[PDB]
Amino acid sequence: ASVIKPEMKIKLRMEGAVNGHKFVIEGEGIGKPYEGTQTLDLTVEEGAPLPFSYDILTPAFNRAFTKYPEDIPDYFKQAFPEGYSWERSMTYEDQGICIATSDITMEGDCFFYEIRFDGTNFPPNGPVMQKKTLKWEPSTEKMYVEDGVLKGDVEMALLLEGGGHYRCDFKTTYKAKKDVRLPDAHEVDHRIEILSHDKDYNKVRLYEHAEARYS
Amino acid sequence: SQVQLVESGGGLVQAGGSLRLSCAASGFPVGRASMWWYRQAPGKEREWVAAISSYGWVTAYADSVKGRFTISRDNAKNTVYLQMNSLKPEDTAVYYCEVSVGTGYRGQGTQVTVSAG
Ligand code: NA
Ligand code: NA
Question: In terms of residue numbers, what domain contains B53?
């Protein structure tokens, strides 16, 4: 038996601020780590209504939920039960910038995330502060090892109202609490989607599908 | 209000010179908030300069300073360093740091003046 069950629940709390607006979001959900699928129900507990596009937050809301082929070592599942943390810089094409940190632990059949999210320098009339984003496009994150830890780069793109795209570069460092078998360079294909939401995004249901592969 | 922020290292340097700023925070748990550099010149509005994550694993820079400035952080203290190389007159300003975003906690700043020539 692995400590990572075929079905794992999720509980999380995010505290953060975007362009000075503070907020707290809590989440509950469930997913299938070996299928690479998960669903989360998120609730704005402080700072409602959010004055910025909810989409900039959603990738901060766990690479344990990735379908890993057997010939690629799975850094994330191996990291449990002790867990792992990641930090991420998100640099937007209009020089908006976000930095997030998340600590991921486990108890029983449930992951626990504590997430800190800070963003600023977004133009007040840009698509983030004016809530003109529609969705993230599906993406491909390039995973590589450097300094003995696992890192990932992905070029991201938000579809805008009117058909434009608004671009972002993600740089992530992932660090397990213990030493684990490190993989070779590979890729992770992602698809993240807000399945439903209420008017102001105080309630959001969020889905990701993710799968690792070599080339 | 044991929370305090103190920037050090500013000064008068000539164009093409170097300075190493630092920003020391007290009153917070070590390495559990991101830290952010800003600067503000005479009649100009405040500019974001650089940022570093809680644990120091990731960094970010404004386009105007990328490749010239480097941000780093003590793993055991809330102390951040901004190595400023290849300085330009446009870099003249008061530089300050903030813990996290939107906290209201700000330091007095440190004056950087870059003399042309
Ligand atoms: Na989204
Ligand atoms: Na969306």
Answer: 1-117
For chain B, the domain total comes to 1
Beta bridge partners of B38: B48, B96
- Resolution in Å equals 2.0
Residues with CB under 5 A from ligand 2 (ion): A 55, 135, 194
Alpha carbon distances (Å) from A12 to A20, A35, A77: 22, 21, 18
How far is the CA of A165 from the CAs of A22, A190, B105, in angstroms?
27, 17, 35
Give A66's contacts (C-beta < 8 A, 6+ positions apart): A33, A36, A74, A76, A188, A210, A211, A212
Nearest in space to A84 (alpha carbons), one of A106, A66, A67: A106
Q: Which of A17, A91, A172 comes nearest B100 by C-beta?
A: A17
CB contact under 8 Å between A89 and B58, yes or no, is: yes
CA angle centred on A181, ends A175 and A183, rounded to 5°: 85
Report d(CA A132, CA A56) in Å as an integer.
11
CA distance linking residue A111 with residue A141, whole number of Å: 23
Structure determined via? X-ray
Q: Which ligand is nearest to the CA of A208?
A: 1
Answer yes or no: are the C-beta atoms of B28 and B79 closer than 8 Å: no
Of A85, A91, A116, the CB nearest to B60: A91
Q: Side chain identity at B39, as an amino acid letter?
A: R
Residue B114 sits at φ, ψ, to 5 deg, of -110, 115
Chain B residues bordering chain A (beta-carbon distance below 8 Å)? 32-34, 36, 48, 51-55, 57-60, 62-63, 100-103
Report whether B90 contacts B64 (CB < 8 A): yes
Decide: B73 and B56 in contact? Cβ < 8 Å.
yes
